[PDB]
Design a protein around this ligand. Structure first.
Ligand SMILES: [Mg+2]
Ligand SMILES: [Mg+2]
Ligand SMILES: [Mg+2]
Ligand SMILES: [Mg+2]
Lengths: 233, 242, 205, 250, 243, 244, 241, 244
């Protein structure tokens, strides 16, 4: 059965599944949790960072791609570096060549296409990392969810990682609320923090644990780590 | 058979996971970071008594402000060190300054997953992951003394103290208990020596273990056997008290 | 133009009319003052009803037409009959992309049922210009006035053959690089008609 | 995408056998019988035109091919593989010889060239050997007449007479009895016709047989007159009628 | 070792299974075609079977216009047939450009056959599951039919048939030619040749056809063309008088 | 023996290419999308599944344009469809650059067909996991095409693919029988919204979002435009009407 | 085009092809090198599977890399030739660019690097060769002896041996070589070396070939006879007791 | 993917042996035997022909003894065609050396180069090895008469007398018996033929089943002379020695 149809991404199973891609989707499911949510003026990313021992640092989950775009990762970090680096480049090309800020919708389309190429050719391997992209462009605030299968979706809020389903329900409920926190950054963040705190279990979110990112109207993508997230626990 | 960049049903890259197993069969390496420097110590582990121990290179200089210890298939680390040194020097050339330790480490880890058979994405030629892990330690003006553990997965974590190699589970455990935000360079040297002594198969002496440290003032220095022996002696005495 | 290569010189023109379009040309090629061929055919078929008048380098224009004929034959096999605008674009792509090594002044003329007759002139740089009629070749300078004064849109076949016959004889008269017989190719719904006019006729008009 | 098959498809098995070459030799064995006989003043290569239906036009399938004006080939095995080998042989005769020395190659060298193409298919990445054995007959100023057989492995050897394919064993036997070094070409053609008769199943006539000779120069087939150094091609394919005239003197 | 049935390497009996299986694929469409030569024409008939009512009948064809002079009918899956069609069209055009004259039907056949042979020998290329019958009225040869297959084989025919009921058609045709003693239909108009063709396909498959059940292509000097439904009906309407 | 289904280009003993057939299965597990050709245009419609309320409504557009006159919609692995459209775009541009006129629909079809078929020739590539319905308006009429993972394609009067393909094809056969005259782009837009709604029953467990687009010589000018605003709601209503 | 990963990790963390390369080394003739106070001697046993050879020509087992450094090996003969040529070329390239011949450590590091590269490059198998490299650094007199293996690992040795039965002779050396009085003479160094190979070669004169390397490009391959004189004197410090 | 069909021709067995090399050696062990014997005044190369008949032209044949230079020749044991590939590159290396230095190429240099080529097919490339073993007979101003042998692994060695192909164990035992360091060419020829005579897998040793060659320095000249015996010369030398 399996070891027959799961050795290469180039192999379709008898039911039309791509196992390597599905196995890629799994590495995301064991990564730490991160939340994304947006109002009509700001988009925030909240991510629970995970350590290896109590003597190590908490691996970063958020990466700035331009002054108006960034993302949080879950899964294989190196892959996130590869993809966020591509995003950085594409963003840069738009500014240099057209003096235009890259649209999040466009960024999403590009990420999909890059991931797809790795799912139709032999020898390669799908990317094993998920990303939540937030950005503020000409059409307002945005949140996008990228999956290694190549499926990119634009959302109001969401979450990925282990126990993601927890925060995914809080947001699914709190929608009518947060989608209206306009002109109030700290609130949106708080909403995000509340959302992320619904997928916890092990410990409580601490100053070494939390990572938040916010972008919006008059706010360039800025990352708040440790020291400056104290006011949100 | 089955590809080299294949994902397991659990979402782990086979070769990378199998790579980490080869690392568990290597000599122990310990680095401890304080506020007066970072100490790196390694277990030499010669295959026979006719081997001139000083030809065993497991702690290497990357640049005056960065040194590193290895564990695993030590031969695989030669290309890594080469890249590390070239990256540090090149940065000095392009920017007339010292490369940040994190940057040096990230550059090294960028090599990691560059393995495969025509893996559609870019040109990655290396038939398999590296079979060695590194402890990279150094100092830069922005983040001070730092120690990093660089794995063949491409991930690297900063640690206050870290052990890699065969006796790492045991050693790491001792590290967890002995490390504190106010250790001194001498205290650190001692611990590395002590912990190395615990997990090693052979009795630790100045010929089968090696120390080194990296400090703002003097940079990377591998401790000469004589300096270490005095430290080993200084240890036998501190332990024989209570 | 490369040192010593055969030149078309020429007096060529393509004129659209009521029933379609007519191509005309003299028949002289030269190498210096020697007339290498006094009876050449500068009206080249790239498709059943898409022809061109060639001027500039004989080598270049033949190479280009040969390639166009091929592109249109393959286009036809796959997508059906090509429009004159398409035939022109192919000529242009070649003339423009290779402007540094070629000397080809080409006039493309063709007949379609939806568009009637059409004329496109591709001058030395590879730019394309659609017009009711075009004149080119070294002899063309001498008839800019005559042609502008006498051309009328929607002329009849008889009238267009006469207009082309008079213009070219004038061009041939003044240009040492033009001469021979006057050749015409009439492109209409009825088919393709080849006309030829000799010196004893056109010279004393 | 891309030919990632850069490894050999023919490898040595534990017994020292090269699987693919043996299997190609088997493919050859199921082929129609073809033979060649070397006389004192010529060589004859013959084969049977196994028409796979009567609606097919046998003439449009030349199993006997001219490689150079003094060299011809016939085969047994996979027809398409032969057709491409002929194309390549005709070409190499020009590229590795006529365009260098101004003259067509000698039989043994053309043979050596074909044999090399066959060997490469036995070792190059991503290919299977050719499933054919050829009989190449020709003439050249310094060696006279020759006949060679080339196998899938690329090995070639010269013969006085031989046969390959289906009834090769029985045919080689008939050849060993009838052959002697004082045969004029007509007698070899005759023996070729006899040998082929036993290999052939049904109708045996000029339209089901293909015979070619390498003999005297044929000026009437040059196409021009005036240059006396080149006297004509030595290769000549016998016509349907030419074969029947000889079948009656059986 | 046992993968000798997946790629084009020899099986212990000297067979190329992949080529054999490519031959079975040519029957996947359950369509039969035949080709006969007139005194100065070549006609190819091919059944046309449009199942789904949602389809645009005008786009379902297995007969291709390769060049002004050459026509090709394919027996086999449409994607491979169209792959072959594109290549044959490119080859015929290139030939004209490089050599100054129209590529002959038989040469195109040989070229396409050589290409198939390559898929037969190199392991990376799979054979195309189709049989190509090229027809035309060659300027040197006259009416012509040359057909190629996945093995890389090709040959010229007096008449030919291809498809699941290949044998019945072939036998019917063989019988007619044995009875008449010539290598072509002795009729002057391609219309009658087309008629003969249809009649004999009916006689052989034991089936009656309507206008939307056939596909016809005719090759004449300087042109090859497919018949419209209405032309086919004129043909059908005329055959309904001998029978 | 077995194993004829582990590598792409391999012919099975019965002449089938199993990897292409498994691709088709990925198509059958996807959303339904259709295409209806009309008297002077084509209409495309697709069912978009609402995985959750968090999806910003009307933003994850699925139908795509090629050049300015071709619409493309597909069912299956969305990314593969995007890949296919990216090529179509390069292919359409190439054609325009060399020939000036925008790419004819039959020519575009084959361009897509040849690329898809190319992916069934080697074991180094996976076939396309999508069926694409596309078409538009050109020099001589409207054209609707549907292309399968095998690279097979033909022209259609109506076309549907995805989970509800059968219901859709059912409803489509009705339309083609009742209106042989043609169908106004207006009516087709309505009918398309209907067919998707009815077809949506073949996946009645999730709420959905309708997406329609069209290309018509009279309503859009031979250019592809999405059905937005008044025109869309009218079609949405006509649908929820003819359901009960 | 061929780039299949032949050297890959297996579930337990071993690189089979590199481990199987060590096995081919275990099957090659024994080689030993021990260093004196002012010399380094390299002994090698001769392949006795077949005999009737022409000793004059046959590729010797100890090869000169430069006038002051030599390399001996155990493993696939054919493979050793590739390592020897690359080392010889690098030796001349170094003289050309640095204006000083290679140190022995550098040369070792170079050969070792080549071996490691073949363990993680696609399409190639590792070298089934282990080597002993010895000589003296330019203008220096301290003897050097280094050992390299298929993995590319290398290090220096007071005395070391590789090849079949190396395990056995390694033991002999482990308890007959003292770093307090290393063979202070060419004579006693060769003696010890011969003693070691005798414990494995099984009474054979022509069976052993010795090569002595002294400072400043002085390398001499002792003759069958000169060694025989050693075997004799050795069977005496064994028979008198 | 494609990995599936790769036999991995350049891997080590768990015992450190090269599969393909060992297997090629086995192939070679079924080839006609070839012997090379080195005298004080010359070298003899003798070979027994494989796959023969009454109809094989022996006059115009050479499948075992090949000239590489006017001073170097080889005897072949293995696949004739593989041999011809290697032979042609050796003939080119020879001329390359002559052009460069204006001196005939030393024998060992030519031998080592050929061996290195064989070794290559052993360590990289993924192609099967050449199934050929060579016995090289040659002369040069530095070592005089030399005899070498090379096999599929790429290893080469020098000999006073050697054999390759079938029944080597038997032949080597016989050579080692009758060979004496001071042999004269006329003696070596006899020994060569005698040895073949006793190790043949066939009835009796006849002329049509042999290829014979000698490289002598005829005292009445200077240039070394390579003689590839013609059919009638082998029949003759076979009578004198007493095999009839
Ligand atoms: Mg004039
Ligand atoms: Mg193939
Ligand atoms: Mg394949
Ligand atoms: Mg269907």
């Amino acid at each position: 059965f399996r070891n027959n149809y799961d050795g290469d991404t180039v192999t379709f199973s008898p039911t039309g599944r791509l196992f390597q891609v599905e196995y890629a989707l799994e590495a995301i499911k064991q990564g730490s949790v991160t939340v994304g949510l947006r109002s009509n003026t700001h988009a925030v990313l909240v991510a629970l960072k995970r350590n290896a021992d109590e003597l190590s640092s908490y691996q970063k989950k958020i990466i700035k791609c331009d002054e108006h775009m960034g993302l949080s990762l879950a899964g294989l970090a190196p892959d996130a570096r590869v993809l966020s680096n591509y995003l950085r480049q594409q963003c840069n090309y738009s500014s240099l060549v057209f003096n235009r800020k890259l649209a999040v919708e466009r960024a999403g389309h590009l990420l999909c296409d890059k991931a797809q190429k790795n799912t139709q050719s032999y020898g390669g391997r799908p990317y094993g990392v998920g990303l939540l992209i937030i950005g503020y462009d000409k059409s307002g605030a945005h949140l996008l969810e990228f999956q290694p299968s190549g499926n990119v979706t634009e959302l109001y809020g969401t979450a990925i990682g282990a126990r993601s389903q927890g925060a995914k329900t809080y947001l699914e409920r709190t929608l009518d609320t947060f989608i209206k926190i306009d002109g109030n950054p700290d609130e949106l963040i708080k909403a995000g923090v509340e959302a992320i705190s619904q997928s916890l279990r092990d410990e409580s979110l601490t100053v070494d644990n939390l990572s938040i990112a916010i972008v919006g109207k008059d706010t360039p993508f800025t990352i708040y780590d440790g020291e400056a997230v104290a006011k949100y626990i | 058979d089955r590809g080299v960049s294949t994902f397991s049903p659990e979402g782990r890259l086979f070769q990378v996971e199998y790579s980490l197993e080869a690392i568990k069969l290597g000599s122990t390496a310990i680095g401890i970071a304080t506020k007066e420097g970072v100490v790196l110590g390694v277990e030499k582990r010669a295959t026979s008594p006719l081997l001139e121990s000083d030809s065993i290179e497991k702690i290497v200089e990357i640049d005056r402000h960065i040194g590193c210890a290895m564990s695993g298939l030590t031969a695989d680390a030669r290309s890594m060190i080469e890249h590390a040194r070239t990256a540090a020097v090149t940065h000095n050339l392009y920017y007339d300054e010292d490369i940040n330790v994190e940057s040096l480490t990230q550059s090294v880890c960028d090599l990691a997953l560059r393995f495969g058979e025509g893996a559609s994405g870019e040109e990655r030629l290396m038939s398999r992951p590296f079979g060695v892990a590194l402890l990279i330690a150094g100092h830069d003006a922005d983040d001070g003394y730092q120690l990093f553990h660089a794995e063949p997965s491409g991930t690297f974590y900063r640690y206050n103290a870290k052990a890699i190699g065969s006796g790492s589970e045991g050693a790491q455990a001792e590290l967890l208990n002995e490390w504190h935000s106010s250790l001194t360079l001498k205290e650190a040297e001692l611990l590395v020596l002590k912990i190395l002594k615990q997990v090693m198969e052979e009795k630790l002496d100045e010929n089968n273990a090696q120390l080194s440290c990296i400090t703002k003032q003097d940079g990377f220095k591998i401790y000469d056997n004589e300096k270490t022996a005095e430290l080993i002696k200084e240890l036998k005495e501190k332990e024989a008290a209570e | 133009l490369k040192k010593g290569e055969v030149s078309l010189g020429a007096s060529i023109m393509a004129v659209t009319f009521k029933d379609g379009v007519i191509l005309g040309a003299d028949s002289r090629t030269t190498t210096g003052a020697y007339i290498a061929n006094r009876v050449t055919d500068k009206l080249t078929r790239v498709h059943d009803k898409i022809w061109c008048c060639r001027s500039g380098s004989a080598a270049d224009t033949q190479a280009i037409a040969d390639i166009v004929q091929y592109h249109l034959e393959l286009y036809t096999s796959q997508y059906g009959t090509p429009s004159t605008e398409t035939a022109a674009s192919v000529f242009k792509e070649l003339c423009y992309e290779n402007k540094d090594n070629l000397t080809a002044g080409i006039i493309v003329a063709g007949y379609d049922d939806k568009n009637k007759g059409e004329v496109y002139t591709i001058p030395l740089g590879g730019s394309v210009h659609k017009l009711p009629y075009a004149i080119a070749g070294s002899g063309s300078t001498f008839i800019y006035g005559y042609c502008d004064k006498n051309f009328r849109e929607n002329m009849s076949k008889e009238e267009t053959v006469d207009f082309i016959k008079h213009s070219l004889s004038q061009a041939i008269k003044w240009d040492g690089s033009s001469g021979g017989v006057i050749r015409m190719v009439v492109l209409t719904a009825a088919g393709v008609e080849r006309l030829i006019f000799y010196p004893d006729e056109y010279e004393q008009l | 995408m891309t030919d990632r098959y850069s490894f050999s498809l023919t490898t040595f098995s534990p017994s020292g056998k090269l699987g693919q070459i043996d299997y190609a030799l088997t493919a050859v064995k199921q082929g129609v019988t073809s033979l060649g006989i070397k006389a004192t003043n010529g060589v004859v290569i013959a084969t049977e035109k196994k028409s796979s239906s009567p609606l097919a036009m046998s003439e449009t399938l030349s199993k006997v091919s001219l490689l150079t004006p003094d060299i011809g080939a016939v085969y047994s095995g996979m027809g398409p593989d032969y057709r491409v080998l002929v194309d390549k042989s005709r070409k190499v005769a020009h590229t590795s010889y006529k365009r260098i020395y101004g003259e067509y190659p000698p039989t043994k060298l053309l043979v050596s060239e074909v044999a090399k193409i066959m060997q490469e298919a036995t070792q190059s990445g991503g290919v299977r050997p050719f499933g054919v054995s050829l009989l190449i007959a020709g003439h050249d100023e310094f060696n006279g007449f020759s006949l060679y057989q080339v196998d899938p492995s690329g090995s070639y050897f010269p013969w006085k007479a031989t046969a390959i394919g289906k009834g090769s064993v029985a045919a080689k036997t008939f050849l060993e009895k009838r052959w002697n070094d004082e045969l004029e070409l007509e007698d070899a053609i005759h023996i070729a016709l006899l040998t082929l008769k036993e290999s052939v199943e049904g109708e045996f006539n000029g339209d089901t047989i293909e015979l070619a000779i390498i003999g005297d120069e044929n000026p009437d087939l040059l196409g021009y007159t005036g240059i006396p150094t080149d006297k004509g091609p030595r290769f000549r394919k016998l016509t349907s009628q030419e074969i029947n005239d000889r079948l009656e003197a059986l | 070792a046992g993968y000798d049935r997946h790629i084009t390497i020899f099986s212990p009996e000297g067979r190329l299974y992949q080529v054999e299986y490519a031959f079975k694929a040519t029957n996947q469409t359950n369509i039969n075609s035949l080709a006969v030569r007139g005194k100065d024409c070549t006609v190819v008939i091919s059944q046309k079977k449009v199942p789904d009512k949602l389809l645009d009948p005008t786009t379902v064809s297995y007969i291709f216009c390769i060049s002004r002079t050459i026509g090709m009918v394919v027996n086999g899956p449409i994607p491979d047939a169209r792959n072959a069609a594109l290549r044959a069209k490119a080859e015929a055009a290139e030939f004209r450009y490089k050599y100054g004259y129209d590529m002959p039907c038989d040469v195109l056949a040989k070229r396409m056959a050589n290409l198939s042979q390559i898929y037969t020998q190199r392991a990376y290329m799979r054979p195309l599951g189709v049989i190509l019958t090229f027809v035309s009225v060659d300027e040197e040869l006259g009416p012509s039919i040359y057909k190629t297959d996945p093995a890389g084989y090709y040959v010229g025919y007096k008449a030919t048939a291809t498809g699941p009921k290949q044998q019945e058609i072939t036998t019917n045709l063989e019988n007619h030619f044995k009875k008449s003693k010539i290598d072509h239909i002795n009729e002057e108009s391609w219309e009658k040749v087309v008629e003969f063709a249809i009649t004999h396909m009916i006689d052989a498959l034991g089936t009656e056809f309507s206008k939307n059940d056939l596909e016809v292509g005719v090759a004449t000097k300087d042109k090859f063309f497919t018949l419209s439904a209405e032309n086919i009906e004129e043909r059908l309407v005329a055959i309904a008088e001998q029978d | 023996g077995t194993g004829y289904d582990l590598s792409n280009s391999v012919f099975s003993p019965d002449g089938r290419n199993f990897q292409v057939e498994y691709a088709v299965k990925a198509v059958e597990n996807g959303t339904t999308s259709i295409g209806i050709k009309c008297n002077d245009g084509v209409v495309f419609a697709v069912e978009k599944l609402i995985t959750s309320k968090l999806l910003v409504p009307q933003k994850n557009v699925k139908i795509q344009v090629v050049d300015r006159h071709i619409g493309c919609v597909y069912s299956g692995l969305i990314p593969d469809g995007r890949h296919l459209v990216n090529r179509g775009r390069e292919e359409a541009a190439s054609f325009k650059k060399l020939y000036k006129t925008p790419i004819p629909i039959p020519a575009f079809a084959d361009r897509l067909g040849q690329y898809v078929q190319a992916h069934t020739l080697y074991n180094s590539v996976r076939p396309f996991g999508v069926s694409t319905i596309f078409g538009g308006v050109d020099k001589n009429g409207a054209h609707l095409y549907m292309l399968e993972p095998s690279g097979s394609y033909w022209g259609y009067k109506g076309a549907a693919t995805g989970k509800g393909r059968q219901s859709a094809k059912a409803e489509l056969e009705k339309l083609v029988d009742h209106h042989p005259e043609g169908l106004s782009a207006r009516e087709a837009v309505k009918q398309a919204a209907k067919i998707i709604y009815l077809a949506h029953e073949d996946n009645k467990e999730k709420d959905f979002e309708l997406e329609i687009s069209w290309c018509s010589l009279s309503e859009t000018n031979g250019l592809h435009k999405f059905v937005k605003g008044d025109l869309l709601q009218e079609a949405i209503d006509f649908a929820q009407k003819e359901i009960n | 085009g061929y780039d299949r990963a032949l050297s890959i990790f297996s579930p337990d963390g071993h690189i089979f092809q590199v481990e199987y390369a060590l096995e081919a080394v275990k099957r090659g003739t024994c080689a030993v090198g021990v260093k004196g106070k002012n010399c380094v001697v390299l002994g090698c046993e001769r392949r006795s599977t077949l005999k009737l050879q022409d000793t004059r020509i046959t590729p010797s087992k100890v090869s000169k890399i430069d006038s002051h450094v030599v390399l001996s090996f155990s493993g696939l003969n054919a493979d050793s030739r590739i390592l020897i040529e690359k080392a010889r070329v690098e030796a001349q390239s170094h003289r050309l660019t640095l204006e000083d011949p290679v140190t022995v450590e550098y040369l070792t590091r170079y050969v070792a690097g080549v071996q490691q590269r073949y363990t993680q490059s696609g399409g190639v198998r590792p070298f089934g060769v282990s080597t002993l490299i010895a000589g003296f650094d330019p203008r220096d007199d301290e003897p050097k002896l280094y050992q390299t293996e298929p993995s590319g690992i290398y290090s220096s040795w007071s005395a070391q041996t590789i090849g079949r039965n190396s395990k056995t002779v390694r033991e002999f050396l482990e308890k007959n070589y003292d770093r307090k009085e290393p063979p202070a003479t060419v004579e006693e160094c060769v003696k010890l070396t011969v003693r070691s190979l005798l414990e494995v070669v099984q009474t054979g004169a022509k069976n052993i070939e010795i090569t002595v390397v002294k400072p400043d490009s002085d390398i001499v391959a002792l003759s069958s006879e000169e060694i025989n004189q050693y075997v004799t004197q050795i069977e005496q410090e064994k028979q008198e007791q | 993917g494609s990995r599936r069909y790769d036999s991995r021709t350049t891997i080590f067995s768990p015992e450190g042996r090269l599969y393909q090399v060992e297997y090629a050696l086995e192939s070679i062990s079924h080839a006609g035997t070839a012997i090379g014997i080195m005298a004080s005044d010359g070298i003899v190369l003798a070979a027994e022909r494989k796959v023969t008949s009454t109809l094989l032209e022996q006059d115009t044949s050479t499948e075992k003894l090949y000239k590489l230079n006017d001073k170097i020749a080889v005897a072949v044991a293995g696949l004739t065609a593989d041999a011809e590939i290697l032979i042609n590159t050796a003939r080119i290396h020879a001329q390359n050396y002559l052009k460069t230095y204006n001196e005939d190429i030393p024998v060992e240099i030519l031998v080592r180069r050929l061996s290195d080529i064989k070794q290559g097919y052993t360590q990289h490339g993924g192609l099967r090895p050449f199934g050929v073993s060579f016995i090289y007979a040659g002369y040069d101003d530095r070592y005089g008469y030399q005899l070498y042998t090379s096999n599929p692994s790429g290893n080469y060695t020098g000999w006073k007398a050697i054999s390759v192909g079938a029944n080597t164990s038997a032949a080597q035992t016989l050579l080692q018996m009758d060979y004496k360091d001071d042999m004269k060419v006329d003696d070596a020829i006899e020994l060569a033929l005698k040895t073949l005579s006793k190790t043949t897998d066939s009835s009796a040793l006849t002329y049509d089943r042999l290829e014979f060659a000698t490289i002598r320095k005829g005292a009445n000249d200077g240039e070394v002379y390579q003689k590839i015996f013609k059919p009638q010369e082998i029949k003759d030398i076979l009578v004198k020695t007493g095999i009839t």
